[PDB]
Amino acid sequence: RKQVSDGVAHIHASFNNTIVTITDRQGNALGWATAGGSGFRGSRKSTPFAAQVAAERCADAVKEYGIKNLEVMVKGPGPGRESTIRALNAAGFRITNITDVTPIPHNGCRPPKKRRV
Amino acid sequence: PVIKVRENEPFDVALRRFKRSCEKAGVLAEVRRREFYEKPTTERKRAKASAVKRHAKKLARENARRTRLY
Amino acid sequence: PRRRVIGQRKILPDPKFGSELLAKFVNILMVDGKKSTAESIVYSALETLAQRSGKSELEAFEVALENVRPTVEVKSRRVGGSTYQVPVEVRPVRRNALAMRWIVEAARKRGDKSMALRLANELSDAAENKGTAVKKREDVHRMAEANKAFA
RNA sequence: UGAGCCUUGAUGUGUAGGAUAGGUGGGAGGCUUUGAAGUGUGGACGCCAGUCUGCAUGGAGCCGACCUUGAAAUACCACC
RNA sequence: CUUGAGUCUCGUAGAGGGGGGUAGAAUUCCAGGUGUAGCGGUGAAAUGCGUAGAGAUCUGGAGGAAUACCGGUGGCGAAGGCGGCCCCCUGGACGAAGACUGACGCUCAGGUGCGAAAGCGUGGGGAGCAAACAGGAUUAGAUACCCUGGUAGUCCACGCCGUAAACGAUGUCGACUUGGAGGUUGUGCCCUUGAGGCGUGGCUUCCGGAGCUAACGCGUUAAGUCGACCGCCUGGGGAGUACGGCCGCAAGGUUAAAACUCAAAUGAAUUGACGGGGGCCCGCACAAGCGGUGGAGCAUGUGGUUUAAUUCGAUAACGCGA
RNA sequence: CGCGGGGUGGAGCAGCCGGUAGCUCGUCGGGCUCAUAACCCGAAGGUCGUCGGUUCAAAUCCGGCCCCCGCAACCA
């Protein structure tokens, strides 16, 4: 595999599960990991800790690519948002940019109905 | 909330800054709001109710303040 | 309780070695307020243990204790629909107690004949890092690890 | 992109162990100015101990039955 | 005659209406790249989608619907309602001065029109959402709430429907009666010496006086003090139902009884009690621990059954009166 | 009369080779429960309609009989 110095970390942070995907700067995904994949289910995988460990796993996976610089793109609302980036930092990439990329419509599609609980 | 880490800037500081930016944006809040459909009526009601509450806080409480507690 | 925290009561150190911890252990062991018998048993356990491992009577005991002390235990919050066991850092006073209690339990369980002998055996096991108390400790730790997501 | 083949190279951890022993027969010394041991490392394999090999440097020696072992040297060798 | 009512002049603010363009974000799908085992979902799960390569991620395309921020107890409209930006057609409101008309006004049974959402008809459209429906949960059951899907419908055109807690639960028009704090939109003067100072008009939010009110409350935007016109009520149920008429493609709307039946039904406020309302606090209430009961045998009391009688009582009763 | 389903624990639905002998509601038992329809634990109820035989496994494969079904055909 071709080594690459700089890339992006996409952090899809949902309410139920965090997904971290490291990619090159062009768009092509190198590796990924998830809180659900990291051995957490239901209550556990919707937590900051879980997200962090997913991030760590992802980092581990893209060791062979030899990535030093990293820009982070954080998507969605969740626990795995601050935690994940911290984890990434710990894992030892130079974090270059921290971007928020939550899809906010400018009033477009009707959301689903409100839950009655 | 696009941000770039400055030269010889700590990670933690950067993170904090990012968080602040996010807060300013009100992105999370927006997301929360758009999770489910709010009927127009409901939306109206909240807005008016909230306004009323605010008004109550401002004036009635001020009146109370004039008189000492003990 | 709700209203007021209270200062822990005064405990006398045991006559043989002059130790608070030892005294506490003896107390824990004791049943039906027969302290003397319990203390004798404890002493016996110590002596045998000392013979086995060398060192001193007290030092060996301490070492044994060390291998069964829990860094972290869990508690049940249960805020959700289902129960969530949450880990908590267990304080110095409590940890020591817990280990002792576990040891005692192990001793009680054990299939050897005399109580003192059983206790000694348990201590030895603890020192070596096998046995019942140690297992219990591991389990406790394991649970905490499992539920580390909650904090 | 799959896949054969004349050919010349590499590849092979039961534990005894100089340590990454496939087996049979002919055998006691093969290689060394169409350049030997030691050093620098480019690319491969890997059971992390090492093994083969490119180019540079070096210029007069490394490896044998060995002590062990159910089987002995990749001292040269042909058959696969 | 000019004070009401209207016309003309110049401005002003506006999601007022109709028509036609366009912009950007986001969702969905399609095609392709990267990539590898999960994704999704919940209180927890499962159905569901995934190694036939999903989810994630990037590129390109399609199409529909709605318009983040601005945005406000802000604005406009008779009400219903109206929200990206641009243009075309178009209705009303307000102010400034003048000039004109000269009571031309107010209200309105029948009548006529406009009238959310759903619904209907014909023809288009269809991304998202979603009655119905299906499956998965939950449950005693769950024809629900939750989850995964999902069709009418929502969108457009032209017709119909004519109702909503269509509410300020407050008809319209006019006059008069103490105050304060704002918002919005004009406009006159003033050294705008500055975001200001002093007025004067329109619409508007809150508080409160007199008065009014069953009280709650209303209070110059009246539910006060009066006048003009209209609409409507006459105990609760039966019933806004039946019959008949009129209207409607239908759904149904509208008009609108009676028998029979009860002595109530209601409104506001009051004291409690209660709440799977909220705040503060306590108790071996939980938590933290130690020892029990529930199994055994016996003692003992009770229930029951039996008995000639198994004395009567207790049932925070049951080693209780004893 | 002939031909396809088969015959059970208070009723019902029981895993192609005969060795598995049930599950639902029900009744009792006891605490939960402010109250139960509860959740949960355990307990009494058979013949496998019947008469026989192939075989140690038989109700469980076959010969006949009694019924319940279903059949479709008939009727001077």
Added chain:
RNA sequence: CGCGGGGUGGAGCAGCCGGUAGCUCGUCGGGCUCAUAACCCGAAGGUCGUCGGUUCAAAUCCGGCCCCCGCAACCA
């Protein structure tokens, strides 16, 4: 009869060189749990159908037999 797959822990799917001897659900113990399941930890169950041999590694490569598959061909 001839020819391609191979034959296992209660069932199933097990990493080209023979030295690795499993994973899922299952049963039991415990941990947590209101519950149940999910979840965590650990524990009993082999022959590798079989008979042999190349070799210290063999079920793990080969010679035969018993079956399960699959084959496609045949039948006076």
